[PDB]
């Protein structure tokens, strides 16, 4: 009702002048939040088929798009494209940067709707080589194909077949191998993962796992990509890579774990553990002091904060936020100098990674790799962590344990299945 009123305002814009010329125009329609919004559940209705929904990890900033004018296969792509309009520098391109941060799937959206803590803009952006005017007219056919909002159903599921890529064995030999080279000097720390295959009766509603995810997982950031009706990505982080406002850049070595405990007293005393063991505060200094490195080149005097303990649903994690000056606004900086994060990849990058590369017995994709958007004025991605694979009734679910000196099997195969039963119960 809200979004019917915004979407006839839509329509009159349409229908006013419009040159057949090329060019971009950008409509911004303000959206009334006297609420009743689940943006989610809307964009899930859709049966327009790149959808992406993205809120960031306060719970303040909120956003679903759909439609693309443009697709990026990466965001050196997309931000050169950006670059073009600098009078739009609010024009922001969404979705996944890989693993590998040189392929990414970002759309130029149709249709933004947005939100920032109490004020929502309902965006329609008009772009052609030739003809604003014939866009326009695309554009109505594409508002004339939204659709009612459907209530959002919970998951049943019951598995047809379960398969682990390492099982037991496989991640064994792995290990082994891994702390075989490290011993023999090089490398330090390699992040290994295991895939989990579960196959279903009849496909999955990926936007209804990403409504119980966020449900489960407050303070994350919440991420899902519908590349179209058969296949997504979805995950809960609570893992920035990186945020910049203009020239402001706000990264976080977000490294060390305890339990969390729902008594928030334990919960309080555990963190205080955390916070004063050496390990784990060693594991942290070791993360921060890499992102440094890795961005000392392009940056004024790295501002390192206080440690502190953030506390999550079954977990409690060290992190040390780390704030700076980039000598220039540019995101592929970012990206290219932050991902593979040394949480997600290990000791020297490259070693790691070419080791996940020869050993890793199944591609990671868009798992470990980022999520959220770009403009030139702004950006912020977060790491997609915590996150699946959706493909039919397939659900492709992801587990990591960092592997050192002097790290056991069995004990990284128990981390292992701890992680992904995190991700197991949104399928119930």
């Given at each position: 009702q809200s979004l019917t009123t915004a979407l006839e305002n839509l329509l009159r814009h349409l229908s006013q002048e419009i040159p057949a010329?090329?060019?971009?125009?950008?409509?911004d329609i303000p959206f009334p939040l006297k609420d009743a919004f689940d943006a989610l559940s809307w964009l899930a209705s859709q049966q327009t088929y790149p959808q992406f929904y993205w809120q960031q990890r306060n719970g303040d900033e909120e956003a679903v798009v759909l439609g693309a004018i443009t697709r990026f296969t990466s965001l050196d792509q997309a931000q050169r494209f950006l670059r073009q309009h600098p009078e739009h520098a609010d024009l922001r391109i969404w979705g996944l940067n890989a693993f590998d941060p040189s392929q990414g799937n970002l759309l130029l959206p149709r249709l933004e709707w947005r939100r920032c803590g109490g004020k929502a803009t309902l965006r329609l952006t008009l772009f052609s080589e030739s003809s604003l005017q014939h866009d326009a007219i695309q554009a109505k056919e594409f508002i004339a194909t939204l659709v009612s909002i459907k209530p959002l159903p919970g998951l049943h599921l019951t598995t047809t077949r379960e398969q682990h890529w390492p099982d037991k064995t496989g991640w064994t030999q792995l290990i082994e191998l891994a702390t075989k080279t490290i011993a023999e000097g090089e490398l330090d720390k390699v992040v290994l993962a295991r895939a989990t295959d579960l196959h279903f009766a009849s496909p999955v509603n990926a936007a209804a796992m990403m409504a119980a995810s966020r449900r489960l997982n407050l303070n994350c950031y919440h991420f899902y990509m519908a590349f179209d009706g058969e296949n997504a990505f979805l995950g809960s982080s609570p893992e920035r890579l990186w945020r910049r406002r203009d020239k402001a850049l706000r990264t976080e070595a977000l490294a060390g774990?305890?339990?969390?405990?729902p008594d928030d007293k334990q919960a309080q005393q555990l963190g205080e553990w955390l916070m004063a063991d050496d390990k784990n505060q060693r594991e942290n200094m070791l993360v921060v002091e890499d992102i440094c490195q890795r961005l000392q080149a392009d940056t004024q005097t790295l501002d390192v904060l206080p440690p502190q303990v953030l506390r999550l649903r079954k977990?409690?994690?060290?992190?040390?936020?780390?704030?700076?000056?980039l000598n220039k606004a540019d995101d592929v900086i970012c990206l290219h100098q932050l991902q593979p994060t040394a949480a997600v990849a290990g000791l020297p990058r490259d070693?790691?990674?070419?080791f996940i590369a020869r050993h890793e017995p199944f591609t990671r994709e868009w798992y470990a790799g980022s999520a959220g958007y770009l403009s030139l004025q702004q950006s912020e991605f977060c790491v997609s962590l915590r996150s699946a694979k959706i493909?039919?009734?397939?659900?492709?679910?992801?587990?990591?344990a960092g592997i050192v000196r002097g790290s056991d099997p069995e004990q990284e195969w128990q981390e292992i299945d701890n992680k992904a039963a995190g991700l197991r119960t949104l399928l119930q």
């Open positions: 010329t090329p060019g971009i125009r950008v409509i774990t305890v339990a969390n405990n977990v409690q994690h060290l992190r040390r936020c780390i704030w700076t000056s070693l790691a990674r070419q493909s039919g009734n397939v659900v492709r679910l992801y587990a990591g």
